[PDB]
């Protein structure tokens, strides 16, 4: 009933750890798996297509990176649901890591070469805009929509956009903060990151951390270590609580773009994120 | 009476929380809403127009970003106004966040392309000068005017400039610190940020935090999390006091410019800012 | 002579606050005020003029940014200086802030345009080398001279240079550290910042803080908030003491250059700095000769 | 027996220090030592060769930087191995340092000059992508494979790649996180860094720290001091335990590339890493 | 005798301060002092000369920045050198500062101009690779040689290089870590910084702090204040001890290069460093 937080449960199995990895959702789906039928783009987006005019901007779904998310089940707790004091899982902390930055050291491929005069040098490494966000909570991540252009003609099939939610075309307010344009991160690879952002007005049971670095050729930067613990406890020493006993993990990890030798076609590059959450049982009213 | 700070008020409803979001004021007003008659520019400025000579610099009002501000009412406190000791609202801290940086990942529009020779690559993302300032206080933010050029011919109507205050043309001292050029942020979308700055000689009842990053193509950088709390208490453990029971929120969040395929026309881009302020009652003489 | 520091003075008016702002001194003097007679450059330097050869470098005075300084009078404390124990003003901390970076968001002027093909785009914003230094003390800031070129021909009148002090031309040691080349920041808008630097070997009663970022097109960066306090107390909990009851404020805040549409002429841009010093009375054993 | 941690062992020789330096493995082997037969490339990779098509990417082994590792012996502790309580070495901290950044100040060589128009200026210093990772553990560093391209044709001998482990060709999942693609850093100069990354799902007895900075001409940055100590103890005050009395040191330190005056050929540059580990004896079940 | 550190000596003169400034050694010696005979280059290096081929690299001595060092005498302490317990000087902390960055604001000289198309703008300020290292110890700084190219033909006289020490030509191992190539900083302006680096394997009685930033046109960055104290005490609260009663100061502060209007000739720029060390007497066995 009432979310009055009490003491920490002690005894056998009062604490537990949950591990999971979320692969990136840059555009090309996991299947087909064939390295000649499209599977070679897994972990990347398909070629970014440009608007044909100021009033005709329709990006393909496979060129739009979307949020990655997973809902994990935790061991059951309450036998009698009609008891005055119950138990709920509380996320204490998380060790998270973006894996694979070293693969970006491959500068021997067939990307646009650094020396275009002779088509020599090295295969230009991934560079540009970077976006890193991760969240852990007891409910789906609450999202607030905001886009660059309310006129963008996002596909009506295969993606969740503002129009999907409102059942109406976007309005000029959608380029700033429009309270009506909200959703919840309840599906993996469906909510475009250029549309949906963590909602600071909600997410009372989720902790999210994000950072953005723009630019066209900005050098990608990343740190990775198994010695860093992110505390999920709030100012009152209480972490997110799994009311429905289902843990939500959310993230997006864009490293930039690689660009081809043909018409500078850009492809987004994303990397997988690992999570290791420490949880404990909490007595609640 | 005497502004002497005493003990914190204890009991029911002694602490409260206020939320609000302030949309950016980059130049294009919220109306008309039409996505063809001007509304498509909401959240951005109109094309930046340049001076025609060293003595003719007349920027259009809709090309100048202005301060965003809001005045929020707090619940009443003092019944017997003639009491030796009264109660005042004290802002303890604020969780603030700039929302929407992910929207800058839209590089599929019709902006100046990265490969201008062939009109290929990606739509150049927002880059350049960035400005982020937020303030919370019990009175309007005190402003000190200072411009790049005292000869700039700002419109007389539609914006509040130094001449609006003094009733006289700017003088050369306005290019440095002129104590006469002062104002108060009492209106939303009216005070140009290239003219009005936080006044360090006043703002005794306001806390402001600002940073600037210049340049023409500087990569935009931004962090966002719901776990960061900004303490508003001064060296003496006392936060801003709402003397007139009206809380003031102020901000400006410029991310840079997008530039068109015609004559490199630049359009400022701003993002909305969220505020969650925690206040408590204070006993004052 | 002996500066023995004792207890803090308690009682009415034992603590005080001093405020002041120092305007930049980039090259163009405050007057003439006319916006057509030169006043339009106030806050900036005049066009930077270059050397004509490896042996002919004569920069104009109005193209050289100089140190800003002010000497503020504190309330008198001791009527008789022969007393065994006296009181002295001690600087505890300072809230300082560089005001006006927002004005650099003006990219609609007549500077060199970003689209050089069509003379469009935006008016290039101020960029380049930045220099920020501030000091608070009970004596003029002690300066150590050091220049890029000992052969530079600084004007003899209008600026205080190494020659003004030594009465002789600069030597090659002046390009590195030469103990002989020293001065004190006793005048506002007279000591070039490319010549005079805070002297680490002295300044026993002054705390200075400086930083430099070079380059030609480097993005200017600046933070400003009224919530940051700079502690002036040393490792022993003692801040600068005013032996002559005159508080000294010094600074230079260069944001970079703006460059015109004619031969890429550069003009330095400086911004004013605000100071709010908190002082307290300190009991001291008579240090008067 | 049971991996239960007890008290710290006290007495003579209860604490010790281990020193070691690991030379970089950028591509060119330590031999031949001749400065005219290839030895002049020691410390660097050989010229990076680029793919000939989107389906033909065959990097030479000597152009691929690999992990450096060393297994150091610690003095024996357990006389009677069948005892209820035994002693194990525990890594408390490490003083590590990358040596030689000052050699990058050599800008008088024969690299591509800064003034290519006239073949003048200075010899362009090492610039570009940087990668620094170091680890200390009581078992080999656990690796997770992830590549830029699952179609890359790595040599079958001379290097350990995903195929070496699985005995099958890489699949599209190998471009993201594929649980099957795992290995252990058991050989020096054999595991390419663009393939093998620290596995966050394992390494329970190893502490690793890594960072990456991409780009083509990014300035190399490095700090070095003998005053910085890296703590290896976890949240519970326990460091890595040497289960087999063998201490594992792992690292890779890429400073960027130098590029020649012929066809912009790039050569990776790596620097040696010093390790000084402090260990103490720990009572274990 | 036995270097067992005991209590801190108390009483009059048990603590003292030492000041010293070390001028940079960029290449041009202090004399000739004449500003027309070479003295005008004091504080800078002479024109950097490039290799004529992959096998002929002969840098001029005056084009190579070297380490700055000074040995300062401290007052004597022991009369009866054969007493069981003696006193020794211990370095507690140091206030160090690089002086002169403001001189880099001179952009009115005759360097390569910013506008090379018309020969206008400003005189290009010092930029590029930066290197800052300082040390304080009771013995000369221990050095480890490591070079970019073991084939570099350094002058046999006027500089101390690896061959000066080993009496033999450099080997390929010298491009990585070769334990044989070691030396001690016992002379001012003689050991090139592109060859000699602080040896982490030794320096038991010296604390050194260094940092490097590469690139060709990287903006120089520097901070300076008389309020920063660098602690020299190790983890055990003991600082460097002067075994021979002579304190060693070492440093190098390269700000980058300035380049001329002729053939882009580069000249290194160095600045002087001030040291103010606080020492105290220590009882030793």
CSV table of N, CA and C in Angstrom, one decimal, chain C residues 239-287:
chain,number,residue,atom,x,y,z
C,239,UNK,N,45.6,35.5,6.8
C,239,UNK,CA,45.5,36.1,5.5
C,239,UNK,C,46.4,37.3,5.4
C,240,UNK,N,46.4,38.0,4.2
C,240,UNK,CA,47.2,39.1,4.0
C,240,UNK,C,46.9,40.2,5.0
C,241,UNK,N,47.9,40.9,5.5
C,241,UNK,CA,47.7,42.0,6.5
C,241,UNK,C,48.0,43.3,5.9
C,242,UNK,N,47.2,44.3,6.2
C,242,UNK,CA,47.4,45.7,5.7
C,242,UNK,C,48.2,46.5,6.7
C,243,UNK,N,49.5,46.5,6.5
C,243,UNK,CA,50.4,47.3,7.4
C,243,UNK,C,50.3,48.8,7.2
C,244,UNK,N,49.9,49.2,6.0
C,244,UNK,CA,49.7,50.6,5.7
C,244,UNK,C,48.2,51.0,5.5
C,245,UNK,N,47.3,50.1,5.9
C,245,UNK,CA,45.9,50.2,5.8
C,245,UNK,C,45.3,50.7,4.4
C,246,UNK,N,46.0,50.2,3.4
C,246,UNK,CA,45.6,50.4,2.0
C,246,UNK,C,45.5,49.0,1.4
C,247,UNK,N,44.4,48.6,1.0
C,247,UNK,CA,44.1,47.3,0.4
C,247,UNK,C,44.4,47.4,-1.1
C,248,UNK,N,45.2,46.4,-1.7
C,248,UNK,CA,45.4,46.4,-3.1
C,248,UNK,C,44.7,45.3,-3.9
C,249,UNK,N,44.0,45.7,-5.0
C,249,UNK,CA,43.3,44.8,-5.9
C,249,UNK,C,44.0,44.9,-7.2
C,250,UNK,N,44.3,43.8,-7.8
C,250,UNK,CA,45.0,43.8,-9.1
C,250,UNK,C,44.4,42.7,-10.1
C,251,UNK,N,44.4,42.9,-11.4
C,251,UNK,CA,43.8,42.0,-12.3
C,251,UNK,C,44.0,42.3,-13.8
C,252,UNK,N,43.7,41.3,-14.6
C,252,UNK,CA,43.8,41.4,-16.1
C,252,UNK,C,42.9,40.3,-16.5
C,253,UNK,N,41.9,40.5,-17.4
C,253,UNK,CA,41.0,39.5,-17.9
C,253,UNK,C,40.8,39.6,-19.4
C,254,UNK,N,41.7,39.0,-20.1
C,254,UNK,CA,41.7,39.0,-21.6
C,254,UNK,C,40.9,37.8,-22.1
C,255,UNK,N,39.9,38.0,-22.9
C,255,UNK,CA,39.0,37.0,-23.5
C,255,UNK,C,39.4,36.5,-24.9
C,256,UNK,N,40.3,37.3,-25.5
C,256,UNK,CA,40.8,36.9,-26.8
C,256,UNK,C,40.8,38.1,-27.7
C,257,UNK,N,40.6,37.9,-29.0
C,257,UNK,CA,40.6,39.0,-30.0
C,257,UNK,C,39.3,38.9,-30.9
C,258,UNK,N,39.0,40.1,-31.5
C,258,UNK,CA,37.9,40.1,-32.5
C,258,UNK,C,38.8,40.5,-33.7
C,259,UNK,N,38.4,40.0,-34.9
C,259,UNK,CA,39.2,40.5,-36.0
C,259,UNK,C,38.3,41.1,-37.2
C,260,UNK,N,38.7,42.3,-37.6
C,260,UNK,CA,38.0,43.1,-38.6
C,260,UNK,C,38.1,42.5,-40.0
C,261,UNK,N,37.3,43.2,-40.9
C,261,UNK,CA,37.3,42.8,-42.3
C,261,UNK,C,38.4,43.4,-43.1
C,262,UNK,N,39.3,44.1,-42.4
C,262,UNK,CA,40.4,44.7,-43.1
C,262,UNK,C,41.7,44.2,-42.7
C,263,UNK,N,42.4,43.4,-43.5
C,263,UNK,CA,43.7,42.9,-43.2
C,263,UNK,C,43.7,42.1,-41.9
C,264,UNK,N,42.6,41.5,-41.5
C,264,UNK,CA,42.6,40.6,-40.3
C,264,UNK,C,43.1,41.3,-39.1
C,265,UNK,N,42.9,42.6,-38.9
C,265,UNK,CA,43.4,43.4,-37.8
C,265,UNK,C,42.7,42.9,-36.5
C,266,UNK,N,43.5,42.5,-35.5
C,266,UNK,CA,43.0,42.0,-34.2
C,266,UNK,C,42.9,43.1,-33.1
C,267,UNK,N,41.9,43.0,-32.3
C,267,UNK,CA,41.7,43.9,-31.2
C,267,UNK,C,41.5,43.0,-30.0
C,268,UNK,N,42.3,43.2,-28.9
C,268,UNK,CA,42.1,42.5,-27.7
C,268,UNK,C,40.8,42.8,-27.0
C,269,UNK,N,40.2,41.9,-26.3
C,269,UNK,CA,38.9,42.1,-25.6
C,269,UNK,C,39.1,41.8,-24.1
C,270,UNK,N,38.8,42.7,-23.3
C,270,UNK,CA,38.9,42.5,-21.9
C,270,UNK,C,37.6,42.7,-21.2
C,271,UNK,N,37.4,42.1,-20.0
C,271,UNK,CA,36.2,42.3,-19.3
C,271,UNK,C,36.5,42.7,-17.8
C,272,UNK,N,35.5,43.4,-17.2
C,272,UNK,CA,35.7,43.9,-15.8
C,272,UNK,C,35.6,42.8,-14.8
C,273,UNK,N,36.2,43.0,-13.7
C,273,UNK,CA,36.2,42.0,-12.6
C,273,UNK,C,35.7,42.7,-11.3
C,274,UNK,N,34.8,41.9,-10.6
C,274,UNK,CA,34.2,42.4,-9.4
C,274,UNK,C,35.0,41.7,-8.2
C,275,UNK,N,35.1,42.4,-7.1
C,275,UNK,CA,35.7,42.0,-5.9
C,275,UNK,C,34.9,42.3,-4.7
C,276,UNK,N,34.8,41.3,-3.8
C,276,UNK,CA,34.0,41.5,-2.5
C,276,UNK,C,34.9,40.8,-1.5
C,277,UNK,N,35.7,41.6,-0.8
C,277,UNK,CA,36.7,41.2,0.2
C,277,UNK,C,36.1,41.2,1.6
C,278,UNK,N,36.3,40.1,2.4
C,278,UNK,CA,35.9,40.1,3.8
C,278,UNK,C,37.1,40.2,4.6
C,279,UNK,N,37.1,41.2,5.5
C,279,UNK,CA,38.3,41.5,6.3
C,279,UNK,C,37.9,41.4,7.8
C,280,UNK,N,38.9,41.2,8.7
C,280,UNK,CA,38.7,41.1,10.1
C,280,UNK,C,40.0,41.7,10.8
C,281,UNK,N,39.8,42.2,12.0
C,281,UNK,CA,40.9,42.8,12.7
C,281,UNK,C,41.7,41.8,13.4
C,282,UNK,N,43.0,41.9,13.4
C,282,UNK,CA,43.9,41.0,14.0
C,282,UNK,C,44.8,41.7,15.0
C,283,UNK,N,45.1,41.1,16.1
C,283,UNK,CA,46.0,41.7,17.1
C,283,UNK,C,47.4,41.3,16.7
C,284,UNK,N,48.3,42.2,16.6
C,284,UNK,CA,49.7,41.9,16.2
C,284,UNK,C,50.7,42.6,17.1
C,285,UNK,N,51.8,42.0,17.3
C,285,UNK,CA,52.9,42.7,18.1
C,285,UNK,C,53.5,43.7,17.2
C,286,UNK,N,53.6,45.0,17.7
C,286,UNK,CA,54.2,46.1,17.0
C,286,UNK,C,55.3,45.7,16.0
C,287,UNK,N,55.0,45.9,14.7
C,287,UNK,CA,56.0,45.6,13.6
C,287,UNK,C,56.5,46.9,13.0
